[PDB]
């Protein structure tokens, strides 16, 4: 298992975040219209997965705002904002701020994504929520970057996520 | 199973809502502070369970506002607002409106409550969400009222829920 921190206090996260050079595991998540979305639906594109505990807490919103803007600066990529929030909470946020580039996806019917992607908080009050994480996937569904954010109350390293998409 | 409707279109709901005169099944749900709450923690009180698909959609908020006010007019009762929303969405709503009488509880780690209470939407886009329902439980954990709302876009019958608590 893995360990992240909340203001220094350890939090247990199941399994292992995918490693660069490994195959991305397929998933099914739920979109704003309650349709089911799979990894294969993005065939041929790069994918940025911005994973977080809740849009309604902490730095998660800040990260959505940032990735929404960054989405405009890269080509042939989808930016997926993924959490255990119901689709309605995710879309409430994006709608209030007019954040139209990111695609919001919910794990509320698909807890197995959190296990497969090594982001399931396993124990404690945050149990059932995703840890803060970024995974970047290439056009051939190979993982080319991941970060399991060590301090959950800090934003992910946007630069590092974007660097693997540059020439 | 049971059938409710969304603008007349049928929606399948698992099992059977508890019937008046039957024992209330125990549950564990998650509160605003991410602590786990059980039915036994309300020993000796009457319980009103206001169950709904999401606080962020439809008539659900209207029902929270109403039950928050009604909570002030009855004695020895807790009013529990229950959904698959994360605790954060529920508390966001209550906080914005200063609705301090209801107790918000989430099924996000406890999908078995939806099955046990015959409120799990089984199929279709709403799968994974609770149907709109009210269950009232007495001081001895006997069910004294339930309503599985036939048209999910209409509010529950507040009067009927409250009538079983009167002399």
Curated annotation (Swiss-Prot), chains A, B:
Catalytic activity: a hydroperoxide + [thioredoxin]-dithiol = an alcohol + [thioredoxin]-disulfide + H2O
Keyword Cytoplasm: yes
Keywords: Antioxidant, Cytoplasm, Disulfide bond, Oxidoreductase, Periplasm, Peroxidase, Redox-active center
Disulfide bridge positions per record: 60-94
Residue ranges of the TM segments: none
Family annotation (InterPro entries): Redoxin (IPR013740), Thioredoxin-like_sf (IPR036249), Thioredoxin_domain (IPR013766), TPX (IPR002065), Tpx_CS (IPR018219), Tpx_Peroxidase_subfamily (IPR050455)
Main localization category: periplasm
Entry EC number(s): 1.11.1.24
SUPFAM superfamilies xrefs: Thioredoxin-like
PROSITE patterns in the cross-refs: THIOREDOXIN_2, TPX
A molecular function (GO) term: thioredoxin peroxidase activity
Active site: 60
GO cellular component: cytosol; periplasmic space
Residues in Thioredoxin domain copies: 18-167
Stored Pfam families: Redoxin (PF08534)
GO terms under biological process: cellular response to oxidative stress
Keyword RNA-binding included in the entry's annotation: no
Subcellular location: Periplasm; Cytoplasm
Major enzyme class: oxidoreductase
Family, similarity comment: Belongs to the peroxiredoxin family. Tpx subfamily.
Function text: Thiol-specific peroxidase that catalyzes the reduction of hydrogen peroxide and organic hydroperoxides to water and alcohols, respectively. Plays a role in cell protection against oxidative stress by detoxifying peroxides. Has a preference for alkyl hydroperoxides and acts as a lipid peroxidase to inhibit bacterial membrane oxidation. Acts as a principal antioxidant during anaerobic growth.
Subunit structure, interactors included: Homodimer.
More info: The active site is a conserved redox-active cysteine residue, the peroxidatic cysteine (C(P)), which makes the nucleophilic attack on the peroxide substrate. The peroxide oxidizes the C(P)-SH to cysteine sulfenic acid (C(P)-SOH), which then reacts with another cysteine residue, the resolving cysteine (C(R)), to form a disulfide bridge. The disulfide is subsequently reduced by an appropriate electron donor to complete the catalytic cycle. In this atypical 2-Cys peroxiredoxin, C(R) is present in the same subunit to form an intramolecular disulfide.
Annotated protein name in UniProt: Thiol peroxidase
Organism: Escherichia coli (strain K12)
């Amino acid at each position: 298992s893995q360990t992240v921190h909340f203001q220094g206090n350890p939090v247990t996260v199941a399994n292992s975040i995918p490693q660069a050079g490994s195959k991305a595991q397929t998933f099914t998540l739920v979109a704003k219209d309650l349709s089911d979305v799979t990894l294969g639906q993005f065939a041929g594109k790069r994918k940025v997965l911005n994973i977080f505990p809740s849009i309604d807490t902490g730095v998660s919103a800040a990260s959505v705002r940032k990735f929404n803007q960054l989405a405009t600066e890269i080509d042939n990529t989808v930016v997926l904002c993924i959490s255990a929030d119901l689709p309605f909470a995710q879309s409430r946020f994006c709608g209030a701020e007019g954040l139209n580039n990111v695609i919001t996806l919910s794990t509320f019917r698909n807890a197995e994504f959190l296990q497969a992607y090594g982001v399931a908080i396993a124990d404690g009050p945050l149990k059932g929520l995703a840890a803060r994480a970024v995974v970047v996937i290439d056009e051939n569904d190979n993982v080319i970057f991941s970060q399991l954010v060590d301090e959950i109350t800090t934003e992910p390293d946007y630069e590092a996520a974007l660097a693997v998409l540059k020439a």
